[PDB]
Symmetry: D2
């Protein structure tokens, strides 16, 4: 691309040790569910207030290399008139943009999906770049079952990610490739390992067929864990299976892997990331975080209303930011 | 994947291929029909777009030659001048309304101007709304070119799987999908090369359709005929027939009921003669060989029409000629003109 | 890829599918024919292997029912008791000699007992030597199973591409390749499942054959009929016919001249009745539907034969019955027995 | 496999810094061409003598983690009655075994090949393991042209390597996967980079579909170079394009990459390897050597006859061994 050098610089930067990505890219719908989750009306006034609370948290932006925004938020102003994107860039945080248009179910499968949003994506990306966005997000969802994920599901999601990745790079956004394997079910960690290995290898083959510049991409995978209905397992076990799965599939050329939290609690996500960064083994990428819920849940709770609870919630948000920052360095302690 | 429309998809796809009938492609965009409308000094206003299509559809004796008409979005909701909805006009004559659903092409990075086709986003809800509007089949055009290194494996793959996913969403919402992998004529290659490329592309298309669990008996194919490139010597209909049918024999399952050829670069008479010769070829052909012609059905009608509505009756005479000729061509019974 | 044998491959593959004829599969290994020879208390010596095959080939009135006989290596160079080379015996009656060329199956690591087929190494020189010996077609058996997660994508791929490479080497050396993706009956699945799996496998096979540039008009297909699993209720011939032919309609190009069904688990009468019903089904079938039967042609002949050569004439009577019945079956003209 | 742990240990060992692989696996035919190349009759007496000269070279076996043998040589004795395989194991060198049965041309391509040898390979491998072999070699050949390598050539060679790899591991031999892209032609280094990237990515996708244990494999690729008819280029340029190509395609899980020399002279091979080991960049595998001709050519010349020329040729063989050893550490100087 004409953006090759800037894609490569920004993707490397996202992976800076001690930093990760906040996912604040919840739709008007999803952020509603979260806003109701603590008895708050889903009005733009409140959507604005929640995101502003996060971004004006005293020690927080230094812990973040990136923030994923929803379209609305990319053009939104803080209360003092400052555009959020300026607020982010002042602190050295790259603004990112969710570009996928949700999932739809594949006929002839058992509730497996493919992700939409290729239509007019190049012109959207260009407009987002002009607005200050420098990376993009697109989520593919795959499930684990008797015959899942199917060859059709894998293929659709891999090549859908690969085509999205190309359009992103043509328009100056570093694509986060996010093939999330859902944790839901009763499978063991070994099964999650095999499936994760299969999916990533299909994804990197797809990315190669599409001539994607790997040094200008990011990966946002699931950690390798037992299913949501299976026994929890220690961080050192998650670490060992996750890192081995990535060693088997993700080229060195990729600069950074920013884990999604999935089912995990705030503390579990942090402890799991931390253990991966304590593992003495070849890891030719930054292992960092791209958390929404695992970074925000305690902050939403403390907040609820406003005023006295802003300062206490900003304290709570800083705790999680600083903990995950520590986790990227293998230096988190309880 | 059974669709809830399986029975109606199968019946309608079979119907399109009724011997003695074919498809009029009147689905050209606001842009393309402009180029055609300017081509005879006519301003591209919806009043004129409406008038051209009305002229075609109200041609006495024409609709009986047509199993289907592909419409552009605008035309699907358009009324004739007398207040008759075009879709009603079509259904009264037994013609199935169809709908172009693709959203154009875009270039693939890292290739030499090869394209992929857009339009999967929100296609299911569009298809459903089109079904409610009277449409019973759909069209999506993938474009492939012939070159030194073309079509590339990436171009083939993107277009095949894009067609396959489109085909599924169509069937889920009750539209028979026309699968249209057009290989463009541009270049200096011979007919043998066009044969090899067409064989490669169709085989990739039917593999993709299988991986997507598409009901083949509820689909249609709209391929290019096999021809020499645009810069090469034109060749007789018997030769086009022999290479085209052999290419289809090698790739298109019997389960597919009808193959409705696109005209592409061809003149009206050349298209008809080519189709006719395919239906005179004594060989296993487990599908109807018919037509889905835009240019090759409309060119002489646009010429005689020109502008004012006292050229209408002479142009409707000219449109009937081409309809009747192509009808004859589906039966191997066309006798020159 | 044009072979220097293209014309002869096309003629011979077409011939195999002559209405009223089919293939005897007498290509069972030294091991398998042992199991059959023990099955009636006969020592597996080459003298007896020779005697069984001689009995078949010298059956008065049998060879006219056969377009082809598949031979094992040993049998291709064997002489009858009167000094007549079997291959000459076959060619005098217009029967093409064929040759099994695969070297058995081996299990795939990381699967649940799925196999891939061996024999590509040195196959071209073997094929050439077999052609020189009088063979004009070849056989290679891939085995796929139906299970919870079977057949796996790896099993399909390995067997499809193994068939495709084999097919090419065959054609380069003048043998029409019989492509034989046998899906085994074992299990409790219903006929619908067998249909879906058979559709998947054949589509992968024809994709592989296309990628390898195989001349389809110079190939044959030897698939399983579509049936319920071995543990499920047997079903009427009309039902086998309808699911089998639909599966073939969805996958096998018209360019393929003949589909010669393997018998698999089926009894003699069941095989014949099943084939017969397929030829009574009024539908697009752009290939000969015929037979390539081993077990289903030989079982009752082995029984009446048993041992000593005064059971020969009664067994040759029994072999003629099955030959004539299957011949009738290719024409849809079998009338029970 | 039942050999998983030993495959992983031996593959890691081949990549020991300061060591590489001698390819002495020339057929009765090929070693003839080499033996005639210096006016020597191709008799077993002489075949025996040449290999013995190499293996009894004073400082040489310590420079080698592996020696690839032909079948004949695996059972051959030295002149003093010592089995070569014992001679190798005493010095800590793993015996390896060429298992492919040559190439054949693919119909409908322009002289592209596929490699034979899957038939009865498991029983061969088992017998070779029993004989002391602990790794295996199989060579796929791909060419660069207008339409080459073709999708058919890539596929056949990738999946042929993947199936060979599996059988090897089932029987305790670490498979060297060798997709050599021939240097022949007028293409530039950028073209060789693109083709090498395409081929390796197809190979690792094939290996994943076949469930190959990557930690128990080796890769033997071409270095990335301009074609044989193009201008030679400096080692630092070969290094930069080669390593980038490997970063884009070869998983970290693979322990070692042992380069084939291809067209290169003895000194050019060494200088090129050396430069790759001087490159400061993520390289999650050993970069070492698997040289036949680039290790042997000067030794064959000095030798010719025997006697006075043995000791001078052993001096010449030690020079090349020590130089390539230095090259694996980035410590070679002229
Ligand atoms: O897996 C994740 O990271 C998503 C983001 C929003 C909450 N959970
Ligand atoms: O590329 C190589 O390493 C081969 C081995 C023998 C000489 N040349």
């Amino acid at each position: 691309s004409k953006f090759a050098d800037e894609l490569i610089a920004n993707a490397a930067y996202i992976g800076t040790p001690g930093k990760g990505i906040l996912a604040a890219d919840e739709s008007t719908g999803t952020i509603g569910k979260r806003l109701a989750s603590i008895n708050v009306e889903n009005v733009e006034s409140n959507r604005r207030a929640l995101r502003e609370l996060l971004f004006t948290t005293p020690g927080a932006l230094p812990c973040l290399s990136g923030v994923i925004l929803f379209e609305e938020t990319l053009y939104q102003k803080s209360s003092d008139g400052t555009p959020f994107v300026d607020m982010l860039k002042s602190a050295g945080v790259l603004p990112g943009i969710k570009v996928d248009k949700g999932t739809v179910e594949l006929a002839g499968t058992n509730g497996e999906t493919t992700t939409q949003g290729l239509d007019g994506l190049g012109d959207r990306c260009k407009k987002y770049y002009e607005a200050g966005a420098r990376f993009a997000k697109w989520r593919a969802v795959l499930k684990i079952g008797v015959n899942e994920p199917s060859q059709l599901a894998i293929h659709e999601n891999a090549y859908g990610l690969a085509r999205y990745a190309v359009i992103c790079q043509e328009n100056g956004l570093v694509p986060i490739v996010e093939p999330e394997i859902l944790v839901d079910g009763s499978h063991d960690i070994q099964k999650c390992a095999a499936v994760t290995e299969r999916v990533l290898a299909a994804c990197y083959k797809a990315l190669s067929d599409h001539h994607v510049l790997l040094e200008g991409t990011l990966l946002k995978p699931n950690m390798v864990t037992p299913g949501s209905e299976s026994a929890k397992v220690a961080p050192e076990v998650i670490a060992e299976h996750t890192v081995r799965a990535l060693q088997r599939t993700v080229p060195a050329a990729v600069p950074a892997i920013v884990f999604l939290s999935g089912g995990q609690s705030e503390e579990e996500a942090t402890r799991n990331l931390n253990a991966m960064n304590q593992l003495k083994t070849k890891k030719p990428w930054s292992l960092s975080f791209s958390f929404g819920r695992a970074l925000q849940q305690s902050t939403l709770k403390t907040w609820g209303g406003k005023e006295e609870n802003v300062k206490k919630a900003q304290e709570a948000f800083l705790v999680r930011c600083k903990a995950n920052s520590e986790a990227t360095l293998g230096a988190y302690k309880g």
